Amino acid sequence: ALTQPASVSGSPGQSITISCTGTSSDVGGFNYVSWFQQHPGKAPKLMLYDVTSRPSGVSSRFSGSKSGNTASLTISGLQAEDEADYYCSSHTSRGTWVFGGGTKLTVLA
Amino acid sequence: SVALVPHVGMGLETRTETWMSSEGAWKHAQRIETWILRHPGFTIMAAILAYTIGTTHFQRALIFILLTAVAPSMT
Amino acid sequence: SVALVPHVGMGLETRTETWMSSEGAWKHAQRIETWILRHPGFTIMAAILAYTIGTTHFQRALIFILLTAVAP
Amino acid sequence: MRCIGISNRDFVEGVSGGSWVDIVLEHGSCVTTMAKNKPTLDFELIKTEAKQPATLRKYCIEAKLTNTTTDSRCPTQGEPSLNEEQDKRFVCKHSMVDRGWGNGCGLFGKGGIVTCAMFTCKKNMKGKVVQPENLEYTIVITPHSGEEKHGKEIKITPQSSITEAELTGYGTVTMECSPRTGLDFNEMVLLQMENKAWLVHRQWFLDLPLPWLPGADTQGSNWIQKETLVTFKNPHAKKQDVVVLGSQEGAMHTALTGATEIQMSSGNLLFTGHLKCRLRMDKLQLKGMSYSMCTGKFKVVKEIAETQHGTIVIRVQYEGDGSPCKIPFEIMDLEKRHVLGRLITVNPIVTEKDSPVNIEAEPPFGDSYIIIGVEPGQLKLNWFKKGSSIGQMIETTMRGAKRMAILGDTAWDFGSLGGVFTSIGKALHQVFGAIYGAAFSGVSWTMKILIGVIITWIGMNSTSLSVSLVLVGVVTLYLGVMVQA
Amino acid sequence: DVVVLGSQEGAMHTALTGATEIQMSSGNLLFTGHLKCRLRMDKLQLKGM
């Protein structure tokens, strides 16, 4: 599976980094690292695929980088609407897909 | 495949007719003659080659026949 | 049979690999070598015949190779 | 960009007075086009489609026999006849059988015998023929825009081979083909098995030794030469029996060594063959080729990448203002004296400030430096190219020789500009290839090496004739070693 | 991609051209070959001599 912290909290307007760790077959060997945002009660939406690049219609606040077997997500300028479930997904070597354990983002009042 | 290595002439033949006696004696003659009639250019080239390397008529004909036999068999 | 008349060398090959390309590249050589190993007497006789018939070493070798190839 | 990563990448340089270049496209391969003041384009043949297939004949590969019959005659009374003997669903054969008093006949000698059995076929393979005008060719036209449906798909038909693609921001590209000369389906048949299909020569398909039906037959009783699939036995010359041969689908598979597998499950999908097409680039433009510099900084998001063709692919991100603006990209040396490389992706442009852009370049052999942006904050990279000019030239000459070998006369049209030398070479190699095809048709490769050895020896031992013979021999050896089958 | 070849029973039949047909569906039965024998007709006598 994919290992990542259960919950990450930070002050609004700050810069925080969250990391997703897998193994060599899925994360450390491939660039199929994508991040999805899950709103409570709403369908998941991709915020980042191919961490070196970013999707269309997504603000440049989200930035992703991969260091070895660990893929990191960095958000600059935390805001209220960023409080949502974030998932890290990787297409493993065996042709299947693996997902992270789910992360809850908390913004201090 | 196995069809390229048939159990032919290995010294086990008896008085009783074998599995493919009649036309098995000849699928050679038919397929080589069909190949000759379908690719005459190779036969011509083999003819010039036999005339060239071969010094006496017998060895010329021998080389020509061997080349003509190889041409479908090697395929 | 059909295996004796493969669809080979008909001038239709392109960049993409054919059906039995890799396996069929050397299968004829393998079966010929196995037949040579398992029938040494005919090979010796063919060598003797090629030595006798020809007039120069080149055609000695050529007749030897042709006789060896046709026999299987 | 779609051609980045494929080992079958080819480059064509320069244009003629009419801005027309002949190019050739193959399945699984693609080419990249660029000129002095033209955008860089990628051309790829992805799909060949035949809409209307016609069944030529059906070859039976498993059969079953029932209703076996036998009739006997005393010696010197001719051979027996049965009413199923005319009924050509029943395969029949006449043999000779010992007859005597113990056999219920008053004479001794060679007695006539005949046996017939109903020929029923379980499953069979179909040979489909398609007229050339029923072919569809799919071409993707993707420019090196640097973007991370990117290209444009166009369709080529033999009856309407004149088409153009409207590229967003590049204007219009005119690409006219000539599929009549690519592959001659007039002599080709699409053999189809239970779930796999092969593209084989029609003449080789007709003379297959199997029972067959006319392509329009439906009831299944018009089988020709069923004797190739059944056998008769006279173990002791006293009674003949007929048995069926085994399934020939494995034998057929072994018989398709040099055949090319195609797809006929969801239509006549062909991923084989070539396509010689005429390219016209009169009306191509560059996206925003008038914008100014990007005076801001840059940062690499994905570092240097080496392909199999000596080029580099870079994705970079802009953070300055003035977008859209031109990307300062150039291959300089350490002390910044002389230009060393050229840009495959001509005119790199930043469409949107936060949108990453992919850039391509071809550094020279040895130390190479990539210049990004301008002072302050200019980026300089330090990639080294492994190889040499002589190595590149020799690899190019093997690639050209093998392409010539595998395309025949059409290979001169890969990068022809209409020059007289190109036409002379095309005609000479066309007549030489016609002679070669009329000479070495239907011959194995090892036999080709044998022939090449023979003529090389003859030329060595026999002077204009000698040099011509050794050249022919070495060409034949190269063809034999390079051909797959 | 890996695909299995076809049925080799027909190829086997085309490979068994020189083999001899024998039946062993119900017990191994052979109807070919030779048998050298030494015949001793010592004790034979003419019926009705």
Short mmCIF file of C-alpha atoms in Angstrom, two decimals, chain D:
data_model
loop_
_atom_site.label_atom_id
_atom_site.label_comp_id
_atom_site.label_asym_id
_atom_site.label_seq_id
_atom_site.Cartn_x
_atom_site.Cartn_y
_atom_site.Cartn_z
CA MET D 1 5.70 15.31 -29.37
CA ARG D 2 3.89 12.03 -29.98
CA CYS D 3 6.99 10.77 -31.81
CA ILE D 4 9.18 11.40 -28.77
CA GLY D 5 10.34 8.06 -27.39
CA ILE D 6 9.91 5.89 -30.51
CA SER D 7 13.11 4.28 -31.79
CA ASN D 8 11.74 4.42 -35.36
CA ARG D 9 12.17 8.19 -35.62
CA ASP D 10 13.31 9.80 -38.87
CA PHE D 11 14.25 13.35 -39.81
CA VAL D 12 13.74 15.18 -43.11
CA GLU D 13 15.39 18.53 -43.78
CA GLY D 14 14.81 21.26 -46.33
CA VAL D 15 12.10 22.05 -48.88
CA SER D 16 11.99 22.61 -52.62
CA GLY D 17 10.85 25.72 -54.49
CA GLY D 18 7.22 24.65 -54.19
CA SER D 19 7.60 23.91 -50.47
CA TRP D 20 6.88 20.25 -51.25
CA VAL D 21 8.71 17.23 -49.85
CA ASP D 22 8.04 13.56 -50.55
CA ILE D 23 7.78 11.53 -47.33
CA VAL D 24 7.05 7.89 -46.51
CA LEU D 25 5.08 6.65 -43.48
CA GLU D 26 5.11 3.15 -41.99
CA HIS D 27 2.96 1.52 -39.34
CA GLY D 28 4.68 1.65 -35.97
CA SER D 29 7.03 4.37 -37.25
CA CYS D 30 6.72 8.12 -37.61
CA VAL D 31 8.73 10.97 -39.10
CA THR D 32 9.51 14.53 -38.03
CA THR D 33 9.52 17.39 -40.55
CA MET D 34 11.17 20.79 -40.29
CA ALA D 35 12.51 23.48 -42.61
CA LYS D 36 14.23 26.86 -42.43
CA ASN D 37 11.11 28.94 -41.69
CA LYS D 38 8.44 26.30 -41.12
CA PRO D 39 6.95 24.73 -37.98
CA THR D 40 8.14 21.28 -36.95
CA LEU D 41 5.51 18.59 -37.52
CA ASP D 42 5.16 14.90 -36.66
CA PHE D 43 3.60 12.44 -39.12
CA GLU D 44 2.45 8.99 -38.03
CA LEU D 45 0.47 6.24 -39.77
CA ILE D 46 -1.64 4.69 -37.01
CA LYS D 47 -4.51 2.83 -38.69
CA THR D 48 -5.36 1.07 -41.94
CA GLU D 49 -9.04 0.23 -42.40
CA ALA D 50 -10.81 -1.78 -45.12
CA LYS D 51 -14.59 -1.40 -45.11
CA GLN D 52 -15.82 -3.96 -47.66
CA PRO D 53 -14.32 -7.48 -47.48
CA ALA D 54 -15.14 -10.11 -50.08
CA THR D 55 -14.79 -13.81 -49.31
CA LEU D 56 -12.55 -15.43 -51.92
CA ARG D 57 -12.65 -19.03 -50.69
CA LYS D 58 -13.04 -20.98 -47.45
CA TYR D 59 -10.34 -23.46 -46.45
CA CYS D 60 -11.47 -26.31 -44.21
CA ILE D 61 -9.07 -27.27 -41.43
CA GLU D 62 -11.07 -29.84 -39.42
CA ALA D 63 -13.32 -32.41 -41.05
CA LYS D 64 -15.43 -35.37 -39.96
CA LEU D 65 -16.45 -38.42 -42.00
CA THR D 66 -19.67 -40.42 -41.66
CA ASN D 67 -21.80 -42.79 -43.74
CA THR D 68 -18.77 -44.84 -44.78
CA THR D 69 -19.62 -47.18 -47.65
CA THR D 70 -17.78 -50.03 -49.36
CA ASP D 71 -18.41 -51.96 -52.57
CA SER D 72 -16.36 -54.84 -53.96
CA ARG D 73 -16.04 -56.58 -57.32
CA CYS D 74 -14.56 -59.89 -58.41
CA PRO D 75 -11.30 -59.79 -60.40
CA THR D 76 -11.52 -59.13 -64.15
CA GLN D 77 -14.90 -57.40 -63.73
CA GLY D 78 -13.62 -53.82 -63.64
CA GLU D 79 -14.01 -51.61 -60.66
CA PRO D 80 -17.23 -51.26 -58.65
CA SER D 81 -19.30 -48.09 -58.74
CA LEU D 82 -21.62 -46.50 -56.18
CA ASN D 83 -24.18 -43.74 -56.51
CA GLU D 84 -22.22 -41.70 -53.95
CA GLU D 85 -19.22 -41.83 -56.29
CA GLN D 86 -20.76 -39.03 -58.34
CA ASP D 87 -21.97 -37.38 -55.12
CA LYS D 88 -18.84 -35.31 -54.64
CA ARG D 89 -19.59 -34.66 -50.98
CA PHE D 90 -18.38 -38.25 -50.63
CA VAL D 91 -14.64 -38.66 -51.15
CA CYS D 92 -13.92 -41.94 -52.94
CA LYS D 93 -10.89 -43.98 -53.94
CA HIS D 94 -10.35 -47.19 -55.90
CA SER D 95 -7.85 -49.79 -54.69
CA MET D 96 -7.26 -53.48 -55.37
CA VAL D 97 -8.14 -56.32 -52.99
CA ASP D 98 -7.35 -60.03 -52.97
CA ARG D 99 -10.43 -62.10 -53.79
CA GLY D 100 -10.99 -65.83 -53.76
CA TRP D 101 -13.24 -68.69 -52.75
CA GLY D 102 -12.97 -67.75 -49.08
CA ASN D 103 -14.14 -64.25 -50.05
CA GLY D 104 -17.31 -65.61 -51.65
CA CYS D 105 -16.16 -65.22 -55.26
CA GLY D 106 -15.48 -68.02 -57.73
CA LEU D 107 -12.23 -66.60 -59.11
CA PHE D 108 -8.82 -65.76 -57.66
CA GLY D 109 -6.91 -62.58 -58.35
CA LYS D 110 -6.83 -58.82 -57.89
CA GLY D 111 -10.39 -57.74 -57.09
CA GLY D 112 -11.69 -54.21 -57.36
CA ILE D 113 -12.72 -52.19 -54.32
CA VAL D 114 -14.12 -48.71 -53.67
CA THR D 115 -14.94 -46.84 -50.47
CA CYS D 116 -16.79 -43.56 -49.99
CA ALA D 117 -17.48 -41.47 -46.90
CA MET D 118 -19.46 -38.27 -46.42
CA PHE D 119 -17.17 -35.26 -46.00
CA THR D 120 -18.40 -32.85 -43.33
CA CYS D 121 -16.31 -29.90 -42.18
CA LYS D 122 -16.52 -28.67 -38.60
CA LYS D 123 -14.77 -25.29 -38.76
CA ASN D 124 -12.75 -23.46 -41.40
CA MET D 125 -10.73 -20.33 -42.11
CA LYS D 126 -11.85 -17.52 -44.41
CA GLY D 127 -9.82 -15.68 -47.03
CA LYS D 128 -11.12 -12.15 -47.58
CA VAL D 129 -10.14 -9.99 -50.56
CA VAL D 130 -10.59 -6.21 -50.56
CA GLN D 131 -10.56 -3.85 -53.52
CA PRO D 132 -7.89 -1.12 -53.22
CA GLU D 133 -10.50 1.65 -53.27
CA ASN D 134 -11.99 0.35 -50.00
CA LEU D 135 -8.93 1.29 -47.90
CA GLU D 136 -8.87 3.93 -45.16
CA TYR D 137 -5.66 5.49 -43.85
CA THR D 138 -5.50 7.42 -40.57
CA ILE D 139 -2.80 10.05 -40.02
CA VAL D 140 -2.16 12.07 -36.86
CA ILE D 141 -0.70 15.56 -37.33
CA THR D 142 0.81 16.80 -34.08
CA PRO D 143 3.10 19.85 -34.10
CA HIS D 144 5.90 20.46 -31.62
CA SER D 145 3.81 22.99 -29.71
CA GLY D 146 5.42 22.14 -26.37
CA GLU D 147 2.09 21.32 -24.73
CA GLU D 148 2.19 18.68 -22.00
CA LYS D 149 -6.36 15.17 -29.00
CA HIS D 150 -3.19 17.26 -29.20
CA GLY D 151 -2.72 16.34 -32.86
CA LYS D 152 -5.17 16.31 -35.75
CA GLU D 153 -6.44 13.08 -37.31
CA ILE D 154 -7.04 12.97 -41.06
CA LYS D 155 -8.28 10.18 -43.31
CA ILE D 156 -6.84 9.14 -46.68
CA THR D 157 -8.89 7.32 -49.31
CA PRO D 158 -7.61 6.00 -52.65
CA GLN D 159 -10.42 7.78 -54.49
CA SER D 160 -9.87 11.04 -52.55
CA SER D 161 -6.20 11.24 -51.53
CA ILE D 162 -6.18 15.06 -51.53
CA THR D 163 -6.60 16.47 -48.03
CA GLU D 164 -5.34 19.14 -45.65
CA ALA D 165 -5.29 19.57 -41.88
CA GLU D 166 -6.23 22.81 -40.13
CA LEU D 167 -3.73 23.27 -37.30
CA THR D 168 -4.77 25.72 -34.59
CA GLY D 169 -2.38 28.66 -34.88
CA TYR D 170 -0.17 27.08 -37.55
CA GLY D 171 -2.54 27.73 -40.45
CA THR D 172 -3.13 24.85 -42.86
CA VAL D 173 -0.95 21.92 -43.95
CA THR D 174 -1.61 20.21 -47.29
CA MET D 175 -0.84 16.49 -47.44
CA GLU D 176 -1.70 14.55 -50.61
CA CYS D 177 -0.97 10.82 -50.77
CA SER D 178 -0.96 8.12 -53.45
CA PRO D 179 -2.06 4.81 -51.91
CA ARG D 180 -2.27 3.07 -55.31
CA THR D 181 1.49 2.42 -55.17
CA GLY D 182 1.97 1.57 -51.49
CA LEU D 183 0.65 -1.99 -51.26
CA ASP D 184 -1.01 -3.89 -54.12
CA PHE D 185 -4.07 -5.43 -52.48
CA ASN D 186 -5.08 -6.63 -55.95
CA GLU D 187 -2.65 -9.49 -55.25
CA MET D 188 -3.31 -9.70 -51.50
CA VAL D 189 -5.83 -11.57 -49.36
CA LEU D 190 -6.77 -11.17 -45.69
CA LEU D 191 -6.68 -14.69 -44.29
CA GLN D 192 -8.84 -14.94 -41.17
CA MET D 193 -8.80 -17.75 -38.60
CA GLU D 194 -11.00 -18.38 -35.56
CA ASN D 195 -9.73 -15.27 -33.77
CA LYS D 196 -6.45 -14.31 -35.52
CA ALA D 197 -5.88 -12.92 -39.00
CA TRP D 198 -2.94 -12.72 -41.39
CA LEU D 199 -2.23 -10.67 -44.51
CA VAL D 200 -0.83 -13.08 -47.10
CA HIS D 201 -0.24 -13.10 -50.84
CA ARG D 202 -3.29 -14.04 -52.89
CA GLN D 203 -1.46 -16.42 -55.24
CA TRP D 204 0.11 -18.28 -52.32
CA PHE D 205 -3.36 -18.49 -50.75
CA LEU D 206 -5.06 -19.97 -53.82
CA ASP D 207 -2.70 -22.94 -54.18
CA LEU D 208 -2.93 -24.07 -50.55
CA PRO D 209 -3.43 -27.88 -50.33
CA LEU D 210 -6.75 -27.84 -48.48
CA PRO D 211 -10.38 -28.56 -49.32
CA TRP D 212 -12.07 -25.31 -50.28
CA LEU D 213 -15.42 -23.76 -51.18
CA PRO D 214 -16.27 -20.86 -53.48
CA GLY D 215 -16.42 -17.65 -51.50
CA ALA D 216 -20.17 -17.37 -52.08
CA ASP D 217 -21.00 -20.96 -51.08
CA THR D 218 -23.18 -21.26 -47.98
CA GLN D 219 -24.60 -24.78 -47.86
CA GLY D 220 -21.16 -26.39 -47.69
CA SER D 221 -21.03 -29.24 -50.19
CA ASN D 222 -18.79 -27.86 -52.98
CA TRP D 223 -15.45 -28.96 -51.53
CA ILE D 224 -12.59 -29.36 -54.02
CA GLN D 225 -9.67 -31.80 -53.61
CA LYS D 226 -10.79 -33.35 -50.34
CA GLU D 227 -8.11 -36.02 -50.85
CA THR D 228 -5.52 -33.71 -49.26
CA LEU D 229 -7.40 -33.93 -45.94
CA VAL D 230 -8.34 -37.65 -45.88
CA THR D 231 -6.35 -40.82 -46.42
CA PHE D 232 -6.98 -44.42 -47.47
CA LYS D 233 -5.13 -47.47 -46.15
CA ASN D 234 -4.40 -50.93 -47.55
CA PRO D 235 -2.35 -52.50 -44.74
CA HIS D 236 -2.69 -56.02 -46.16
CA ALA D 237 -4.37 -55.37 -49.55
CA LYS D 238 -7.55 -57.03 -48.28
CA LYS D 239 -9.80 -54.13 -47.18
CA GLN D 240 -9.44 -50.35 -47.41
CA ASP D 241 -10.64 -47.89 -44.79
CA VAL D 242 -10.72 -44.09 -44.88
CA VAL D 243 -9.87 -41.88 -41.90
CA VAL D 244 -9.66 -38.13 -41.51
CA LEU D 245 -6.47 -36.20 -40.92
CA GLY D 246 -6.03 -34.04 -37.85
CA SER D 247 -6.64 -30.35 -37.31
CA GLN D 248 -4.48 -28.27 -39.64
CA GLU D 249 -4.74 -24.99 -37.71
CA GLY D 250 -1.38 -25.63 -36.06
CA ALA D 251 0.06 -26.69 -39.41
CA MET D 252 -1.44 -23.55 -40.95
CA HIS D 253 0.15 -21.45 -38.21
CA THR D 254 3.51 -23.04 -39.00
CA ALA D 255 2.80 -22.28 -42.67
CA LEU D 256 2.46 -18.52 -41.98
CA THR D 257 6.07 -17.97 -40.89
CA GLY D 258 6.58 -14.88 -43.04
CA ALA D 259 2.99 -13.69 -42.82
CA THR D 260 2.07 -10.47 -41.01
CA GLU D 261 -0.61 -10.69 -38.34
CA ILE D 262 -3.51 -8.25 -38.67
CA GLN D 263 -6.78 -7.59 -36.84
CA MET D 264 -10.22 -8.56 -38.14
CA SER D 265 -12.19 -8.82 -34.89
CA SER D 266 -13.77 -5.34 -34.83
CA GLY D 267 -13.12 -4.50 -38.48
CA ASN D 268 -10.29 -4.83 -40.96
CA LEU D 269 -7.67 -3.17 -38.77
CA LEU D 270 -4.24 -3.31 -40.41
CA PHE D 271 -1.10 -2.17 -38.59
CA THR D 272 1.31 -3.07 -41.38
CA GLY D 273 2.69 -1.68 -44.62
CA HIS D 274 3.98 1.71 -45.68
CA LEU D 275 2.55 4.84 -47.28
CA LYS D 276 4.41 7.16 -49.66
CA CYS D 277 2.73 10.56 -49.40
CA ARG D 278 3.34 13.98 -50.93
CA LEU D 279 3.63 16.79 -48.37
CA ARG D 280 2.97 20.45 -49.18
CA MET D 281 3.67 23.09 -46.55
CA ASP D 282 2.87 26.35 -48.35
CA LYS D 283 0.42 27.64 -45.72
CA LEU D 284 2.06 26.82 -42.37
CA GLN D 285 2.64 29.44 -39.68
CA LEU D 286 4.29 29.73 -36.27
CA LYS D 287 2.19 30.39 -33.18
CA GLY D 288 2.87 33.91 -31.96
CA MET D 289 6.18 34.21 -33.78
CA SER D 290 6.03 38.00 -33.25
CA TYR D 291 6.02 38.12 -29.44
CA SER D 292 8.97 39.54 -27.52
CA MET D 293 11.33 37.92 -25.01
CA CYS D 294 10.44 36.39 -21.66
CA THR D 295 12.63 38.69 -19.57
CA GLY D 296 11.76 36.76 -16.40
CA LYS D 297 13.40 33.71 -14.89
CA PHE D 298 12.82 30.01 -15.50
CA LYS D 299 13.05 26.73 -13.63
CA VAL D 300 13.34 23.20 -14.99
CA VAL D 301 10.55 20.88 -13.87
CA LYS D 302 11.89 17.79 -15.66
CA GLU D 303 15.61 17.56 -16.31
CA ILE D 304 17.65 16.54 -19.35
CA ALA D 305 16.36 13.50 -21.24
CA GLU D 306 18.23 11.56 -23.93
CA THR D 307 16.33 9.79 -26.69
CA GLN D 308 17.62 7.10 -29.03
CA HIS D 309 18.26 9.72 -31.73
CA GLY D 310 20.62 12.13 -29.97
CA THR D 311 18.03 14.80 -29.17
CA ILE D 312 16.99 16.33 -25.84
CA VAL D 313 13.51 17.00 -24.44
CA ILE D 314 13.02 19.63 -21.73
CA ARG D 315 9.95 20.86 -19.86
CA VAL D 316 10.42 24.29 -18.30
CA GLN D 317 8.16 26.70 -16.42
CA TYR D 318 8.03 30.49 -16.64
CA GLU D 319 7.41 32.76 -13.64
CA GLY D 320 8.03 36.22 -15.12
CA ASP D 321 5.62 38.66 -16.70
CA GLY D 322 4.96 39.51 -20.34
CA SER D 323 3.32 36.19 -21.18
CA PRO D 324 2.83 35.20 -23.90
CA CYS D 325 6.46 35.66 -24.94
CA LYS D 326 9.28 33.92 -26.77
CA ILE D 327 11.58 31.48 -24.97
CA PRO D 328 15.31 32.30 -25.30
CA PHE D 329 16.74 28.89 -26.21
CA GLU D 330 20.07 28.25 -27.90
CA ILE D 331 22.95 25.75 -27.73
CA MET D 332 26.08 27.74 -26.83
CA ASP D 333 29.58 26.80 -25.71
CA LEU D 334 31.24 27.50 -22.35
CA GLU D 335 32.87 30.83 -23.24
CA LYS D 336 29.86 31.67 -25.48
CA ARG D 337 31.70 31.85 -28.82
CA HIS D 338 29.84 29.82 -31.45
CA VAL D 339 26.42 28.27 -31.97
CA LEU D 340 26.71 24.50 -31.62
CA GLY D 341 23.21 23.02 -31.93
CA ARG D 342 19.83 23.58 -33.54
CA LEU D 343 16.26 23.55 -32.23
CA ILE D 344 14.04 20.65 -33.27
CA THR D 345 11.10 22.49 -31.66
CA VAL D 346 11.54 25.70 -33.63
CA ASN D 347 10.32 28.87 -31.91
CA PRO D 348 9.57 27.74 -28.33
CA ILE D 349 6.69 29.86 -27.07
CA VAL D 350 5.06 30.38 -23.67
CA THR D 351 1.33 30.22 -24.36
CA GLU D 352 0.37 30.76 -20.72
CA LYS D 353 2.53 31.86 -17.80
CA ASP D 354 1.78 28.92 -15.49
CA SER D 355 1.61 26.34 -18.30
CA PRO D 356 4.76 24.19 -18.65
CA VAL D 357 6.28 23.93 -22.12
CA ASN D 358 8.26 21.07 -23.67
CA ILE D 359 11.30 21.97 -25.79
CA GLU D 360 13.44 19.82 -28.08
CA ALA D 361 17.03 20.33 -29.21
CA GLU D 362 19.84 18.44 -30.94
CA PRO D 363 23.16 19.11 -29.18
CA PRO D 364 26.46 18.38 -30.93
CA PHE D 365 28.80 15.60 -29.91
CA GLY D 366 30.83 16.42 -26.82
CA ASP D 367 30.15 19.15 -24.28
CA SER D 368 26.84 20.94 -24.82
CA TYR D 369 25.25 23.85 -22.99
CA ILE D 370 21.58 24.85 -22.94
CA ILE D 371 20.86 28.56 -22.52
CA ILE D 372 17.49 29.45 -20.99
CA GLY D 373 16.35 33.03 -20.57
CA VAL D 374 18.56 36.09 -20.18
CA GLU D 375 20.48 37.71 -17.36
CA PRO D 376 19.68 37.94 -14.56
CA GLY D 377 18.68 34.40 -13.60
CA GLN D 378 19.67 32.81 -16.90
CA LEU D 379 19.80 29.00 -16.80
CA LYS D 380 22.79 27.10 -18.20
CA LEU D 381 22.75 23.30 -18.38
CA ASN D 382 25.64 20.85 -18.71
CA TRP D 383 24.60 17.82 -20.75
CA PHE D 384 27.25 15.80 -22.58
CA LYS D 385 26.55 13.88 -25.79
CA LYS D 386 27.94 10.35 -25.99
CA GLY D 387 29.09 9.44 -29.49
CA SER D 388 30.95 10.89 -32.45
CA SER D 389 30.27 12.42 -35.85
CA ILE D 390 31.68 9.35 -37.60
CA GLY D 391 29.48 7.10 -35.48
CA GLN D 392 26.41 9.18 -36.29
CA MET D 393 27.26 9.10 -40.00
CA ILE D 394 27.75 5.33 -40.04
CA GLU D 395 24.54 4.71 -38.09
CA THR D 396 22.80 6.97 -40.60
CA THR D 397 24.19 4.97 -43.50
CA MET D 398 23.04 1.64 -42.03
CA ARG D 399 19.61 3.16 -41.40
CA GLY D 400 19.43 4.41 -44.98
CA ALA D 401 20.63 1.09 -46.40
CA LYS D 402 18.11 -0.93 -44.39
CA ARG D 403 15.33 1.50 -45.31
CA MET D 404 16.26 1.12 -48.98
CA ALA D 405 16.25 -2.66 -48.58
CA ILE D 406 12.83 -2.72 -46.91
CA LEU D 407 11.06 -0.07 -49.03
CA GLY D 408 12.40 -0.90 -52.49
CA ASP D 409 12.09 1.88 -55.05
CA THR D 410 9.84 3.92 -52.74
CA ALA D 411 12.79 4.57 -50.41
CA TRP D 412 14.07 7.27 -52.76
CA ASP D 413 10.81 9.12 -52.02
CA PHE D 414 11.48 9.35 -48.28
CA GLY D 415 13.13 12.74 -48.68
CA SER D 416 12.98 13.38 -52.41
CA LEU D 417 12.79 17.02 -53.50
CA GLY D 418 12.20 16.22 -57.18
CA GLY D 419 15.88 16.34 -58.09
CA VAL D 420 17.13 14.67 -61.24
CA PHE D 421 19.64 12.59 -59.28
CA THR D 422 16.83 11.29 -57.07
CA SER D 423 14.77 10.36 -60.14
CA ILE D 424 17.70 8.57 -61.79
CA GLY D 425 18.42 6.64 -58.61
CA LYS D 426 14.75 5.75 -58.21
CA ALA D 427 14.53 4.43 -61.78
CA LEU D 428 17.76 2.43 -61.54
CA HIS D 429 16.83 0.88 -58.21
CA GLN D 430 13.32 0.23 -59.53
CA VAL D 431 14.57 -1.81 -62.47
CA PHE D 432 17.14 -3.54 -60.26
CA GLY D 433 14.45 -4.40 -57.72
CA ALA D 434 12.17 -5.69 -60.47
CA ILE D 435 14.96 -8.00 -61.63
CA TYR D 436 15.63 -9.05 -58.03
CA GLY D 437 11.97 -9.82 -57.35
CA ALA D 438 11.69 -11.77 -60.59
CA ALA D 439 14.85 -13.63 -59.49
CA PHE D 440 14.56 -14.36 -55.75
CA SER D 441 10.78 -14.62 -55.30
CA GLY D 442 9.70 -17.10 -52.64
CA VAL D 443 13.16 -18.03 -51.36
CA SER D 444 14.39 -18.42 -47.79
CA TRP D 445 16.93 -16.05 -46.27
CA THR D 446 19.66 -18.62 -45.57
CA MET D 447 19.46 -19.55 -49.24
CA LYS D 448 19.95 -15.84 -49.97
CA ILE D 449 23.19 -15.82 -47.97
CA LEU D 450 24.26 -18.96 -49.82
CA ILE D 451 23.62 -17.29 -53.19
CA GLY D 452 25.42 -14.15 -52.07
CA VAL D 453 28.43 -16.23 -51.06
CA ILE D 454 28.41 -17.97 -54.44
CA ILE D 455 28.42 -14.77 -56.50
CA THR D 456 30.96 -13.12 -54.18
CA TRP D 457 33.31 -16.05 -54.74
CA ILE D 458 32.70 -15.96 -58.50
CA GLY D 459 33.44 -12.24 -58.64
CA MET D 460 36.56 -12.65 -56.52
CA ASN D 461 37.85 -15.40 -58.83
CA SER D 462 36.83 -13.70 -62.10
CA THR D 463 37.65 -6.79 -63.91
CA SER D 464 34.42 -4.86 -64.44
CA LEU D 465 32.52 -8.15 -64.33
CA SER D 466 34.38 -9.04 -61.13
CA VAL D 467 33.50 -5.78 -59.37
CA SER D 468 29.88 -5.93 -60.53
CA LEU D 469 29.58 -9.51 -59.28
CA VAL D 470 31.09 -8.78 -55.87
CA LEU D 471 28.82 -5.75 -55.47
CA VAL D 472 25.77 -7.86 -56.32
CA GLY D 473 26.95 -10.54 -53.90
CA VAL D 474 27.49 -8.18 -50.98
CA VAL D 475 24.12 -6.53 -51.63
CA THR D 476 22.45 -9.95 -51.61
CA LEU D 477 24.24 -10.86 -48.37
CA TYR D 478 23.08 -7.61 -46.76
CA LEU D 479 19.52 -8.26 -47.91
CA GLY D 480 19.62 -11.79 -46.53
CA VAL D 481 21.03 -10.82 -43.14
CA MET D 482 18.66 -7.85 -42.82
CA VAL D 483 15.46 -9.64 -43.91
CA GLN D 484 13.44 -11.22 -41.11
CA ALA D 485 12.22 -14.14 -43.23
#
